[PDB]
Symmetry: C3
């Protein structure tokens, strides 16, 4: 009897799992919302600088209307290589945002110290790929909480806590090509291996080098470390980048996983839309919503409040035609990156509606218990939309100057709804509904144009 | 000089051949119609129970409008495994219908006894895959006739004879997980290998076990058996599941093979339609036509009558917009599973037209020489439509409660055109065109709702 | 740590490079236009006879509206095999036209003699594939010039010179299965290896056989010859048919390469159109423009004139809705194969506009310095359009009796604009705008129907 080759099967469940970390794929936790869980780990936050500028350039006539296609190709070529390194070193990519990604090595506490070494090595080999746009890496380690929120058809997750705040702080101090360790990371790490320099007015440190002792063999050490990695591809599957590539059909699991992915992506996965339809440079309105709490590291407090805000946000977005693209913790608060005008989702008066939706969200969320401040930034223009990452691990994301602008507005103008000039001028709303604002110097924004507060219909 | 790898070529002829058995692919018989041929073999009829119930469940809100996609994934995952086993054991899959399939091992008479052993083993290994919805297996052996019928643009085939009737009888007696042998099968088989129990009021037997003698080696025995298998992948091609995967372009052959496949499938094969467009849960009307003959095992009699009925059926289906999905022998007669509303084929007043088409077919077929009785069942509702099977061997098929209902109506209400309540109520026809019928208890139907005879315009 | 398999990456740059020779892919020359360069090499011109007749036959009812799909399948099956041989023997396929292709082995002068041997062998192994429609092969060797012309969004190239004229002359003398050598080829070749017969009234010769001396080993000789082949896949990439399959994203390079490929092809490459949409048998109008010069072998003279004509042609084609499918040197002159009605490009009054565009091109090009004669043939009917070649090397092309007719009209009726009867009769133009022409016997045309000169609006 023959023993024919088994072909890779690219079932819809496997395709869906590309869009999600192991934390979710193999999580098997309750369908109740909010759901919280607690663990320890090391985080890596990898940022590619210069892609948002490249984004603007890919709109120019030189790209002959194939800007989006060229941008996603060059971005994915570079991001794919980073993803491969993270996965080979045993990390779980949690999320992509723009040209940045966040990865997790979940371990028990006793193994944090060794795993930090692995992650440092990984992070130095990532810098290598590009020594030959810059990459910056922040690392943190310690306690981590996960929150899963949503309704009967949609799910979102995020990670929370001091390590999560730390990893974003660390990445923001990095220069071109630094690997920065949070203070707790530096304190938990194997200091006999790792040569650092202090960072000015900072407790975080910079890695100069990995200097292992005489008898040290990284491959044997890494092997020891795989004992603690639940899903590291092994044995018959050691040629795979993810165990999730072996997932088999299972309707209950697929029903649970699909809730995390946008309907237009599921349409492509189901071979009901061309695989190229979602890469585009298109005019949209970004509504960037930030919620601040008394204590943002405390999942049992903030988890219900986020769920409550979520329930309202999704109902107003449904009505005024928008989508939540991403949710994550910023240095301050839980942020919802919302988009009006995604592929196949393009209402008329998109701008007016973005502004009224923002106001509704603002008024409702301001009265949710435990939410201290709501801030919303609204900006409109041409943004890149597309699936970013590796074949085995990728997500739909948005990149562009107006995305960055909406995020900076919500942080620099807290407690109000602000909009840019495009939104102001193109809205069908009377001028006294706005207030023209003082110009602020904003980290990473060349010249915003005039900014406005959306004051609303009365007062 | 280099010797670069030859890539699998997935020519349109190869894609077309996935939809057909070797019996047709390598048949090279005359284009005249009807065409009949005669041979001997073993048949296996494998039924997956519980898929039509699963079908109903995949319509519920929990599947979030991806019911069809989830159903076809889970069905194909399981059916694919069965197909692989059949193919590795040297069988030719003849046809899929719903969640059931029919396979053939064509051999010369002297080899029936050994080949039965191979098929029994195959059938026990199929039961294995699922011990870890149930599968039931009927086996038969003996004389088999093939009939090919059609016109200049379309071809259909079916198998006929006592073995074919036997294999369906055998499969209907099976409990969850039985392998049942027809009486002739049991009589031709190697009784020193095979432990059976009798079945009550039945000459068919149930296989308890394969108990081979001391010196027996299944792999050596199977090798001996491959001498008699014309198309068993071998040598350079022993890694392939089908020789048909090596078919090369040949316009004359492709013109002959395409006539068996529906135009919408050929559109997908030709990369002119998305590969996901044909998996759907959609409202259709099933018109299930049964023709009974004096002697249904006698191809030279029934073949012309089937061709004559076919010519008329296809002309009325063209006019009132319907398709023949499948044709096969039932316990009694030749059945045409006809469908109104397939993908891209959805007329208005679909129901009225289904009923007038049914009446036309009934009146014409009743006067075809040798057709003793015509019976037609008409039912409408949501049915699963899609390509079922393995990558290398699959077919378009329909599954659902209304498919089963139309088949049961035509068997339990012989000699008339019957319809369900959906059809009755939604037709644009006056009520006295119908007769409300006595309720019958029907094998495999929970509660049909009221049933009607379509009496027609006069009387 | 695992070392997972790297998957073939099928980036858009790689897909674009399939449509272009190495001469362009790895050319890295200036964006100024015209650009000329000069080198030496051997050319092979391979013609498949009988495909244009097959084309007509694939329109018949027997192909059941899948003529185009069947034609492209059978053509590509055969052409692919020829492409593989050319590539394995180290050639660069420059261009496909219809069922013919032109290949280049670029080498330094001292190596012409050995390389001719390699090309002869290649050409005899191509004849072999089909001894088991005919192939004819013309070979030439010597000085070659390349011209690149175009504007800011589009680029075209062609090769020019005595060797290029020679290779077309040689291929036109060939009978079924001859390999013919240009006179210069025969003079530069290793005459101790190659047995020839003279050809009547011709200095070109026919190859009867390769007869290598005792100590000769073709594989060792070929290896020596690879020293001179810049891009021969080797080492880690020796399993590849083209080095271009390893191209990595590079926006500057992709911007330069995409200018050679039609927008509808780039749409398919970008997964924004189904991969089957461009294979069709469709009614179009061919406008075949020939420009003759005093000296057609002299790139520095003719290159500016071609660029000047190009600039005007492309502006009139944009306005009256047409496309340049191909440009190449004929026995006499530079020819532009222009098409009205390509996929997605189908204006109404296509015929009138084809004729006015032809007149505009004629009047303008006649006054370009160095262009001695302009001749334009216009014919309309059903032509095959599609991507022809191998997966790794293919191009969009048109095949059909009306393509051949337009080419023959422009050569047999020099110095005027001519049209066929379909164009004449279907144009919305008055009859005195035409002159009915004497019938000429035209190489390769059965019966043209009446032919007309487009005289134009006055005189
Ligand atoms: Cl997160
Ligand atoms: Cl059958
Ligand atoms: Cl050329
Ligand atoms: Mg960034
Ligand atoms: Mg069944
Ligand atoms: Mg030709």
């Amino acid at each position: 009897m023959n023993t024919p080759k088994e072909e890779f099967q690219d079932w819809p469940i496997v395709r869906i799992a590309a869009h999600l970390p192991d934390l979710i794929v193999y999580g098997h936790f309750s369908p109740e919302r909010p759901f919280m869980d607690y663990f320890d780990g090391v985080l890596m936050f990898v940022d590619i600088s210069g892609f948002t500028a490249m984004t603007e350039k890919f709109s120019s006539a030189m790209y002959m209307d194939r800007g989006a296609e060229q941008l996603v190709e060059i971005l994915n070529y570079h991001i794919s290589a980073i993803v491969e390194k993270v996965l080979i070193f045993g990390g779980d990519i949690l999320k992509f945002a723009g040209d940045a990604l966040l990865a997790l090595w979940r371990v028990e506490r006793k193994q944090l110290k060794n795993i930090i070494t692995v992650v440092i090595k990984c992070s130095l080999e990532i810098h290598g790929l590009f020594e030959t746009i810059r990459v910056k890496i922040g690392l943190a380690a310690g306690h981590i909480s996960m929150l899963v929120f949503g309704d009967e058809t949609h799910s979102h997750f995020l990670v929370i806590g001091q390590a999560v705040d730390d990893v974003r702080l660390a990445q923001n101090m990095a220069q071109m090509n630094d690997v920065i360790l949070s203070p707790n990371c530096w304190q938990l790490c194997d200091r006999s291996m790792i040569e650092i320099e202090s960072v000015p007015d900072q407790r975080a440190v910079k890695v100069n080098f990995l200097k292992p002792p005489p008898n040290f063999n990284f491959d044997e050490f890494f092997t020891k470390c795989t004992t603690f990695m639940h899903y590291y591809p092994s044995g018959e599957h050691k040629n795979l980048l993810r165990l999730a590539c072996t997932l088999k059909p299972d309707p209950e699991l697929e029903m649970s996983l699909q809730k995390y992915v946008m309907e237009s992506i599921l349409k492509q996965i189901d071979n009901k839309q061309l695989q190229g339809y979602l890469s585009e440079l298109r005019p949209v309105t970004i509504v960037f919503v930030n919620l601040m709490f008394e204590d943002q590291d405390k999942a049992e407090e903030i988890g219900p409040a986020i769920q409550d805000a979520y329930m309202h946000i999704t109902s107003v977005l449904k009505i005024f035609q928008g989508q939540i693209n991403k949710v994550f913790m910023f240095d301050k608060g839980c942020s919802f990156l919302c988009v009006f005008g995604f592929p196949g989702e393009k209402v008329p008066d998109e701008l007016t509606h973005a502004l009224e939706c923002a106001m509704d969200i603002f008024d409702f969320c301001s009265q949710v218990h435990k939410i201290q401040t709501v801030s919303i930034g609204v900006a409109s223009g041409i943004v890149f939309c597309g699936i970013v990452g590796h074949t085995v691990r990728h997500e739909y994301t948005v990149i562009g100057q107006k995305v960055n602008l909406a995020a900076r507005m919500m942080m620099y103008y807290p407690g109000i709804v602000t909009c840019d000039s495009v939104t102001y001028n193109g809205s069908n709303l009377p001028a006294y509904f706005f207030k023209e604002l003082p110009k602020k110097v904003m980290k990473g924004v060349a010249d915003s144009g005039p900014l406005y507060q959306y004051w609303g219909r009365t007062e």
